[PDB]
Design an enzyme around this catalytic site. Structure first.
Site, PDB file in Angstrom:
ATOM      1  N   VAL A 151       0.708  -1.185   0.153  1.00 49.94           N
ATOM      2  CA  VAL A 151       0.555  -0.263  -0.110  1.00 49.94           C
ATOM      3  C   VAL A 151       1.273   1.401   0.088  1.00 49.94           C
ATOM      4  O   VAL A 151       1.610   1.134   1.052  1.00 49.94           O
ATOM      5  CB  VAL A 151      -1.068   0.118   1.273  1.00 49.94           C
ATOM      6  CG1 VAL A 151      -2.190   1.236   1.071  1.00 49.94           C
ATOM      7  CG2 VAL A 151      -1.304  -1.016   1.461  1.00 49.94           C
ATOM      8  N   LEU A 152       0.680   2.204  -1.081  1.00 48.80           N
ATOM      9  CA  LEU A 152       1.400   3.318  -0.848  1.00 48.80           C
ATOM     10  C   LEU A 152       1.363   4.441  -0.095  1.00 48.80           C
ATOM     11  O   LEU A 152       0.440   3.846   1.142  1.00 48.80           O
ATOM     12  CB  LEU A 152       1.021   4.088  -2.058  1.00 48.80           C
ATOM     13  CG  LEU A 152       1.232   3.024  -3.524  1.00 48.80           C
ATOM     14  CD1 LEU A 152       0.779   4.139  -4.817  1.00 48.80           C
ATOM     15  CD2 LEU A 152       2.102   2.132  -3.979  1.00 48.80           C
ATOM     16  N   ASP A 203     -17.677  10.228   2.613  1.00 47.83           N
ATOM     17  CA  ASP A 203     -17.045  11.306   2.389  1.00 47.83           C
ATOM     18  C   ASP A 203     -17.104  12.570   3.176  1.00 47.83           C
ATOM     19  O   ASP A 203     -18.085  12.536   4.044  1.00 47.83           O
ATOM     20  CB  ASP A 203     -17.266  11.848   0.668  1.00 47.83           C
ATOM     21  CG  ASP A 203     -16.090  12.800   0.460  1.00 47.83           C
ATOM     22  OD1 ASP A 203     -15.001  12.220  -0.024  1.00 47.83           O
ATOM     23  OD2 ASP A 203     -16.763  13.944  -0.391  1.00 47.83           O
TER      24      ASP A 203
END
Lengths: 154, 361, 92, 82
Positions: free
Chosen positions: B152-153, B240
């Site tokens: 995972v970045l 969000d």
């Protein structure tokens, strides 16, 4: 918006023996020439319990400042054993590479430091008297904890 | 056909398998808050999910999901919004023999998004592509984080990645001052100079009079009436931070105006300090505005495509998501199980289609 | 002696609700304001912001703490780990 | 002469949920006191800065923007340099 900013910090001698000096290849950037200089402190947190067992290992001054990318070497002296509790010396602790301009601290970098014996026998059976000449430090450079305070410059 | 569109982009020799689960466009809640004294604009939502899988062996039927991405599509009389909700990987792509050093996931994402844009483009209608990037361990595949080959970045990594995904789609249009297009990035906690560092390298060589990447919010392109309260100017997506904050702010209403945030600039100034954007990692909001010139009933035909009911879609997706991907075998088993579940939900014996790359460059 | 393992995060999400209850946090803020010797008080939105930043600070600090505990080759975090995380962040 | 401290009112389960969110796997039983201490210290600092700013502004109520102003003095913490 900051004038000066760090682009990277390489650690040259690692893992080094505990008493070996700290050497950092620091790469930063500058947007415009400045009146004063940059100041770089390197604190060692000997004991996490209190903010007293902190030792400012060295302090280099860099002036003036060239516009663009700049590299330089940073040497500092090993911490004093006489100011460190003989209990928390071997294990994990923290070093703080701070940078200020004209005194005003504007960048603070934090690294984790693991002190460890060179032989497995000394790790399994640690003596009450710390064998300093058999202790190497390994610092984590993969995740430097960078904190950026915005300050006034000129 | 999405299988073809994806096949064109993938490297030659790379054999994968795709499953595209969608839903019929049904009435939903308005993406934008209703201005005072008015009814909310009618909105048609439409779900999408792409699942890309491979095989550790060329002969046997062992199938492993390597990638998954979910896209919501919103449709109002004057706007088409493509929202990228979640996207995750399992990292078992290393099992693919001669898996090129090429960014496969980036190409798949790019191709999928391109396909959706093309097939959902309407005559004389503005089309926007929104997404919200933040690096976290796993989104869709539980325990995939514990697979040592899943990488995972970090924050900046994932932001740069999404920008490189979006860039080529933007490049397929004309600059804005024929179809035009503009890109908008916002990274809370970053000034414009620092934000520009997240742009693709191509942005460095654009015309300074008409750039392609901007560090701002597409206000006058989303809302014809800038005198409207700020609440009606920000999209309320599912899962969000923008939405959460907009609700917390709407709590202040008794006029349309909040009490603690009077302008959009204030809204973002505050957003840069919310719980999600300042937890030690960076976060990036991204939008792609596309202006058209002047501004079985489905475009996807592949056997990988299945159009389910809203309920059935939720069933499928939730089924896949609450699985296990800790190991190879568990991931295989989960892939098979979900495949069968989808086949059952769509009253077929099999759903999915094989894809092979044509691109040799 | 009170040592607890935490529930596995099967899947993360992007927006997350706060975890500290509104009223306890509020009366804590009122206490702190009281003891700072001031006669003014916070807006509800302001206390909201305060809590947001507090929980953000805490999640980060816990990340650093977990990291420190990993570097001691352990899974269970301790007091010293948190102190170290504080110093690491740049506190005194 | 001993009054109550509201910081002990922030329950342990919330602390553990915050820890879980921070990616922690197991915690000690004797950690909560220190946690409450740190929380209270940070909150103290931010509150004091914001209150100060409000007072100087000659106003009787701390706006959310005053809190933002206070937090900007706390610096920004990330991983790496980019």
């Amino acid at each position: 918006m900051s004038v000066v900013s760090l682009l990277g910090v390489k650690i040259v001698n690692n893992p080094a023996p505990f008493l070996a000096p700290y050497q950092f290849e620091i790469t930063f950037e500058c947007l415009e020439q400045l009146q004063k200089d940059l100041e770089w402190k390197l604190t060692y947190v000997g004991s996490a319990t209190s903010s007293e067992y902190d030792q400012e290992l060295d302090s280099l001054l860099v002036g003036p400042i060239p516009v663009g990318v700049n590299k330089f070497l940073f040497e500092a002296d090993a911490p004093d054993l006489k100011r460190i509790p003989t209990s928390e010396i071997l294990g994990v602790t923290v070093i703080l590479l701070t940078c200020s301009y004209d005194g005003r601290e504007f960048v603070r970098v934090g690294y984790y430091v693991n002190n460890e014996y060179d032989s497995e026998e000394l790790t399994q059976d640690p003596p009450a008297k710390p064998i300093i000449e058999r202790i190497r430090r390994n610092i984590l450079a993969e995740k430097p904890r960078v904190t950026r305070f915005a300050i006034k410059w000129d | 056909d999405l299988g073809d569109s994806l096949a064109k982009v993938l490297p030659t020799g790379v054999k994968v398998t795709i499953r595209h689960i969608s839903s019929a466009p049904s009435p939903c809640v308005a993406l934008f808050a209703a201005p005072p004294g008015e009814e909310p604009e009618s909105t048609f939502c439409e779900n999408h999910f792409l699942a890309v899988s491979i095989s550790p062996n060329e002969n046997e039927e062992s199938e492993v999901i390597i990638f998954g991405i979910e896209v919501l599509v919103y449709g109002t009389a004057h706007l088409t919004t493509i929202f990228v909700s979640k996207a995750d990987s399992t990292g078992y792509l290393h099992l693919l023999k001669n898996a090129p050093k090429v960014s496969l996931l980036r190409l798949i994402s790019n191709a999928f998004l391109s396909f959706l844009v093309q097939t959902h483009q309407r005559p004389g209608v503005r089309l926007m592509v929104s997404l919200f990037a933040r690096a976290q361990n796993q989104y869709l595949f539980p325990g995939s984080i514990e697979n040592p080959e899943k990488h995972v970045l970090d924050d900046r990594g994932l932001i740069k990645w999404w920008c490189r995904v979006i860039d080529p789609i933007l490049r397929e249009y004309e600059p804005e001052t024929k179809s035009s297009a503009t890109a908008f990035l916002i990274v809370p906690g970053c000034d414009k100079f620092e934000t520009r560092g997240f742009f693709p390298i191509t942005a460095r060589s654009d015309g300074k009079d008409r750039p392609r990447w901007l560090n701002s919010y597409p206000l006058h392109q989303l809302c014809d009436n800038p005198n409207a309260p700020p609440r009606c100017l920000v999209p309320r997506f599912p899962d969000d931070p923008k939405t959460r904050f907009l609700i917390d702010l709407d709590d202040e209403l008794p006029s349309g105006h909040w009490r603690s945030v009077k302008s959009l600039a204030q809204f973002w100034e505050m957003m840069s300090f919310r719980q999600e954007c300042s937890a030690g990692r960076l976060v990036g909001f991204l939008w792609l505005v596309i202006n058209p010139p002047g501004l079985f009933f489905w475009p996807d035909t592949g056997r990988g495509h299945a159009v389910l009911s809203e309920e059935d879609y939720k069933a499928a997706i939730n089924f896949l998501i609450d699985q296990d991907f800790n190991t190879k075998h568990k991931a295989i088993a989960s892939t098979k199980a979900w495949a069968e579940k989808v086949a059952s939900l769509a009253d077929q014996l099999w759903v999915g289609q094989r894809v092979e790359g044509r691109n040799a460059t | 002696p009170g040592t607890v393992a935490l529930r596995e995060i099967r899947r993360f999400q992007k927006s997350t609700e706060l975890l500290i209850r509104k009223l306890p946090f509020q009366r804590l803020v009122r206490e702190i304001a009281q003891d700072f010797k001031t006669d003014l008080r916070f807006q509800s939105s302001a206390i909201g912001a305060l809590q947001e930043s507090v929980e953000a600070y805490l999640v980060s600090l816990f990340e650093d703490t977990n990291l420190a505990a990993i570097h001691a080759k352990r899974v269970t975090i301790q007091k010293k780990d948190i102190k170290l995380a504080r110093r690491l962040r740049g506190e005194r | 002469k001993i009054l109550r401290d509201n910081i002990q009112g922030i329950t342990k389960p919330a602390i553990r949920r915050l820890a879980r969110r921070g990616g922690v796997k197991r915690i000690s039983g004797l950690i909560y006191e220190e946690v409450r201490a740190v929380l209270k210290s940070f909150l103290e600092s931010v509150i004091r800065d914001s209150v100060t700013y409000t007072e100087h502004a000659k106003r009787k109520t701390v706006t959310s923007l005053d809190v933002v102003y206070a937090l900007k003095r706390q610096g920004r913490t990330l991983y790496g340099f980019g």
